[PDB]
Design a protein around this ligand. Structure first.
Ligand SMILES: CNC(=O)c1cn(C)c2ccccc12
Ligand SMILES: [Cl-]
Ligand SMILES: [Cl-]
Ligand SMILES: [Cl-]
Length: 163
């Protein structure tokens, strides 16, 4: 575990993270995809061997000794708000199990279902609260990666509010 487990947020490419493992915002078919998924494919392509996994689950594949945790959030274009919410919470609970099993002291994590799987809605608060619900009982240092300057502010405020 980390000596004083923390949450932090950085506005940069998750492919350049300084953590002991990475969470991919994966698709269910283990395809290169778009956005975070395509950055992860370019950096750790070996990690996409047998990475396909259902919605609401996480599957870890090693790139050398570096773990890539493929976490499949729901596409809110296809799911109802209710079922999508259930699967998004489930994907993060599976991430917490994997982080724990791996014994890492730190993990880089994107906000699942906030990009092309958002169904054109702002899901910052919904996705971040499910992240907190899952990761709060873990002792890894969590570093959240985002792209948008206003999202960085909001995520930073949400972290600092609970401290
Ligand atoms: C979540 N972060 C990303 O997907 C990013 C990808 N690139 C190329 C970036 C450049 C500046 C800041 C963030 C990103
Ligand atoms: Cl960057
Ligand atoms: Cl997404
Ligand atoms: Cl963002």
């Amino acid at each position: 575990g980390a000596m004083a487990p923390s949450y932090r947020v950085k506005r940069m490419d998750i492919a350049k993270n300084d953590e002991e493992c990475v969470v991919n915002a994966a698709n269910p078919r283990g395809l290169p995809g778009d956005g975070v998924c395509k950055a992860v494919y370019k950096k750790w392509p070996e990690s996409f061997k047998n990475s396909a996994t259902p919605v609401g689950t996480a599957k870890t594949v090693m790139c050398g000794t570096y773990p890539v945790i493929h976490a499949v959030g729901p596409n809110f274009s296809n799911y109802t708000e209710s079922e999508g919410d259930r699967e998004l919470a489930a994907a993060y609970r599976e991430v917490a199990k994997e982080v724990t099993r791996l014994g890492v002291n730190s993990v880089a994590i994107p906000l699942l279902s906030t990009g092309v799987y958002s169904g054109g809605k702002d899901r910052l608060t919904q996705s971040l609260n499910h992240l907190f619900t899952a990761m709060d009982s873990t002792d890894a240092d969590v570093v959240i990666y985002c792209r948008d300057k206003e999202w960085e502010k909001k995520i930073s405020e949400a972290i600092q509010m609970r401290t």
